[model samples]
Target: LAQTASQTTSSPVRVGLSVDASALGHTIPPDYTGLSYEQAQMANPNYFSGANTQLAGFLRTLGRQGVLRIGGNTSEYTFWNRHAKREVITPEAVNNLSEFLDKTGWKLIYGLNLGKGTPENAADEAAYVMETIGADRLLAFQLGNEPDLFYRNGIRPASYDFAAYAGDWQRFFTAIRKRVPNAPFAGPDTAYNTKWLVPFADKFKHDVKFISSHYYAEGPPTDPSMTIERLMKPNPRLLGETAGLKQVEADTGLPFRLTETNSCYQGGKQGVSDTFAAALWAGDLMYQQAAAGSTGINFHGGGYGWYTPVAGTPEDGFIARPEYYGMLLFAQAGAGQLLGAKLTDNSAAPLLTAYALRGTDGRTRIALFNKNLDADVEVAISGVASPSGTVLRLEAPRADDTTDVTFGGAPVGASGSWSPLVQEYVPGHSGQFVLHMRKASGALLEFA
Candidate 1:
């Protein structure tokens, strides 16, 4: 599974994003907006507009990430009908709310309700998404959510098998192709059950643009070390997660996208999800995935105080969570093929990392991170900057807990409770320092 060489330079991290817009209606409590300035025991959360401001800006920040996909466990893919349920999704609705994507220049992999809809209906919806939104505009259409998970509800156990499902998809695609004639498709939109992927992809490679997958730093009920902030510190196994999924692409010879992912599920932990640690984790994770030859990675999130990056006005406005900044750092790394990476102490404990990017200038650009909580590092690239250089590290004051964290430097991680925003570049890396970073921080170095 190979993707286009969009990186004009050698730096290989593509940084597009995927998010669920519908969560703005369900996840947020009904009364989250019913607060007043006068009788407030709690400070009003920085609410994001239901409009596209923060998302537009956020997408603007991560322009390097590739095609966008919209759907999650919350997407209208299961337990809901495309035409019969209360909040069943419609092609006309997506057509109406596609401004966030129009301004972003990224492609899409829109998901449809396959659990409840017939192949004819799914095909009709795919045709409308392509014709209405234009197939040329998106990367592909996802056939369903994690179809493997449909067994939990009372859906037909027969549809859960990959062979049967692929048959349905072939039918759906045959119909949609008749209408739009140019839709690119990808799937088994799955995060956990990928057993059927490689086999299904083996048979469907010529019919699709890429094979996709997902990952989560942690499961539901929040784990501190799994947030964006602590991602690089504790769970070194996440690297293995990316490394493992790459085989699916290799086996099928189709491109791959980490279509949905996040620090944790069931709404990320408050301060941890929004902390600077998350940003540091995000940058390194994206950088690592790209260097290994990934199409792109989308951080799946959205829900009031749950896992989203931006919230609404009178709820939680434009204040970016730490992972938002992490996404920005990854985008700033620019477009380029991965020239590969060399970590300073990878075997020692996955601490220091180095990723080289080919710049538009024909020179090399490198992104380096020092994930060690108590050590300093000086990593030299194979053919780039190796002298007194600039390093702007990202860290929060208190790495021990989430109390020292902030919006940029205050204590509100999300619409939830207050905790330190840990993980900004710590002050005090003296030699050639643009900003001295402390323990457990990241730096954006411009070495060419």
Candidate 2:
């Protein structure tokens, strides 16, 4: 019981993780993990088609019941054209998306053009999407992408505010509903502004199926403040936002979804967003949101951008980025009722976090993240009866490493196949087990 003796002996920092087996928290939804794509990407009919098995394979690796959101900044600029082809969303594109959704068994949250489109056009597009994608695979239709930024982005006049936006939304809602009476909707997809939530939830409570907003941990990509070190640390802004979201959910019965989000805004920073650090950040973000009562999260990415989970195009071939590894870790963790977990640390600064889930199959999974880059730590986990379990690690060459990342000791192949090639067995002593975790890495321990 002598702490000074252990410190003098050079033992790894000891952290205590206590789990509440009797206190089961939120139930993580099956479609809690998802990816968001630009509406303009639909121009390439081959990209979202079942024939593009590579993309489908990559998507399946994330989660079978994941959600795919089709909307982004480009969504506001994209116009639907029935004919005269290139650079527009056509029937062929929607049909291909339907096929892609079917192949992957993922749901769709399609975005309509509100910045530069008429309600009539959205109705036409919604009708086709309903008939093609079908009600089974379609989750809901989002009226706009980040409508709160309309004033700043020149989509609307300076006079336009939530009230005005609501007016326009009502118009679009009326038109779309007239066309397809049973169109399911979700909205007020603002870009990081939680102030809109109260009014949105109150006004459109009956009109919308769920509330949605976007988030980015850091932004602009060019700002000097955006670094790997900063990305790994806990963010106060996110915590505040999560709290606000919970309050809205409590006041109203509607659930909230992070329809679009990522590490850095403005398409992400090159080295920081594309590196292994992003993997840890993303994995932690998913758990944080899920624990805070979020229904789902859609990480926005496309092409070979810095923040895309899966990079590359259909012509160039697809590859999983570092963030995808984080998602894969979560997918492997599986859906379950979140168990109450607490971490007591003896370090000078907080650098580690813990999450436990009582899985649907009755297995218990503990996900540990070590955000400290300078020190390794040993975790003593208690409150579970299992004597042994397997630990699947999420790692890379270094925190800033870009291409050399793996989960469960194996890299995801180009065709999107992945299986744990190596697993560390953790033996229990009495009713507790010690887990040694390296700096800037994550692991998922499964106990039955």
Candidate 3:
């Protein structure tokens, strides 16, 4: 056989899914990947400092162009020192944060104290952030943490609506503009309601750069139905929100991002949110978001609760959790243009989904996820002529198992060093590509 001769032969085969690389779509932004944590955590000197080399290594593995958001329920609790008010965060904390952001090469989407502090205080915080971190390193400033819940939390009145929120937002915007005229912003950072996004975007179109929000499939970690099945089940409502978000994107002409999200909210369910299945969920969920035109996604995590991707350790400094593996795989594979993919079978039920991305080098990458716990799947690829390809599989003992998750056959070490060990090539037959998918695992194929 000549080196450049035909690779696949003429044959007819049934495929569970088909990927059309020729139908290449939008380029996923290099900065599309990210992680979110509590704003109060930013006040800690040791957390983001370069001293935690293991954590740095773990984060670096995700990519340098990532976004790191500091906000959550506690953003409201944070008080800027410049305000001369009762403050928990000071100038030193901001200096350390600047060093951390510079060292990691990741931008910050720092949140303000909208729930309690005055607009003047937030403006001061924004100006100081830009002064200490440099404007280039900051992506945007999130004005409020989830204003939709303010009424219930007694931060706002029950009569508060879009008009009221807009009034308050403008006041803060004006105050911040006075301090840092060029300060970029993102909001309304609502928790569940997508309804406010459009109005919020329309009203603050000129002042804000991105429409931001948060999502968690389920929560409080105490729900009886928070099972692996529930976590993996595809909800039509969630997928439907993409269209609504796209409408806002079109209306406001600004990108939208899910700034804070995880498998389960309120600390996460012990077994479900902290399992191998959550990894699969993260990959599938992010793919769905990307396919729907979302420009960025930041998975929520931090020390206050249990859903953190990388947990602390006394001896190792830090350890990559199961969810971190999913994020790592996603960041590793998500780049360049996202190609078209179609699924033809539902045998795996809620556990199967596929994604395709053609890299800048013209190599087409196909990701096959099988969330099913009891069986393997035979996947066939169409559209791209498969000459030869490399495979990287994400595997573990089981979906609910936590300790043994591995990507590309190597466990992410405690030091965060990882080198994928490739599997033997599966030859393409007559332009038809065949992929063998194991139960409860996923694989990525790069066609040459």
Candidate 4:
């Protein structure tokens, strides 16, 4: 009811859906294994920074996910220094990281080490990835991670432009292609910058197969605009931001992928990270991306202090946080192609982020998010045809402190939360769609 819009119940406007599920692309350094990082940092297990066990566990969680991107800021600049290796940093450290993904039914989009690395060094790392990860498991390669990111972190600001990046990329691409001729490729993993796309594509479209970019719903640390309320606004920013890649996709005719994303920059809200609020935002953005014809939306997660949610590192545990719950909410809504849906007109406040999906079962799913800071929401939906006797309602008793999203009225602790947090498909309500729904505390409901 914030800014109501009539979505004809009889003829609902379809909101599309897609998901990235590739949050661990950031470097896990020294160890993401959590075994050592957990012990070393104790209270702050941000250790496990290398692509180790922690990395393996994360990818395995997203078993059904595809288009996995590797490398981030650390990755873009990381390289093997055979001269005098320090802190156990080298390609071999993560050489086998992609192997786990290969076993998980995922495609690879490895990024090149561009920052602080020579074109030859970048080519060397690319070769190692190609050689170890195997081209078969390989899908496409992103030339670099957010080349435009140089503006921040006081690193010479990348000449404050993309043209410079395009030049650097050509040198790296020319070198890497020479090594892996058949290697699939893409470029400009730039953030909030499409100015580099046409120029890069125009010159190398013959070689590139995909286009990608990163987006963060909110900015860093503490920003007022970066909140659950604003993220779910579903206004010009969300519309333009999610659909913004279209221009890049159309320019090159290569599919677009939101390589990296999250509600906010870095790890996301402390409570929001694994809260129902995140699930709400995730469902809408995922569907919107898919509907726009993009390939996927990889919501970034984990690497929190480089620890597991269960590690009990309070500030950083392996235990799935509130944001992780958002992933679960999305799992219930719908995956694959989305169906038509429209928002019902109502005076009642709507806090849950919702997504509508028409499944292959002839039943449509309307996933609603109830990210209310307080109170429960009785989201009475009316579009179902001859509803089931007991339509499921997924709502937790509280928000920020709870992640108990239920299906078919299941009681608390009835099911495992991490099972769904890992991107695993948690299908409850069996054959009959969990149709007809009401959610509170930013819950995600899947009902047909």
Best by lDDT: 2
Mind giving the per-residue lDDT tens digits that candidate 4 earns over 1-448?
0221211123222222221222111211111111111111211213223323444444344334544555566654455553432022354344444544545556666666566667776666667767877877776777667666776864447365766776777787888778777767776665544466556656677778767667667754465655545755554555675555666566667666677776666545555545555545665566556666666655554355211122232233344444434444454444533544444432244444455555435455555554444423333443444333222334455443345644333422211233322111122333322222223333343333
Best by TM-score: 2
**What's the lDDT for all of these models?**
0.52, 0.86, 0.77, 0.49
- The order of the candidates by lDDT, greatest first, is 2, 3, 1, 4
Cα lDDT tens digits, model 2, 329-409, are: 999999999998888874642678789999999999998878888767788888988966778889897999998898988
For candidate 3, which ten residues in a row score worst on lDDT? 1-10
After superposition, the stretches of candidate 3 with alpha carbons farther than 4 Å from their true spots are: 1-15, 83-87, 192-195, 219-224, 313-316, 345-350
- Which scores better on lDDT, 1 or 2? 2
Please report, as a residue range, the 10-residue window in candidate 2 with the lowest summed lDDT.
1-10
By TM-score, rank the candidates, best first: 2, 3, 1, 4
**TM-score of each model, paired residue for residue:** 0.72, 0.95, 0.91, 0.71
lDDT of prediction 3: 0.77
Candidate 2 overall lDDT versus native: 0.86
Model 3, residue pairs in steric clash: 8-430, 9-430
Off by over 4 Å in 1: 1-51, 76-86, 90-92, 154-159, 192-194, 219-230, 233-244, 313-316, 344-350, 376-388, 400-436
- Which residue ranges in model 4 land beyond 4 Å of their true spot? 1-63, 81-91, 157-160, 201-203, 220-225, 305-317, 332-334, 350-353, 360-363, 372-383, 386-394, 402-448
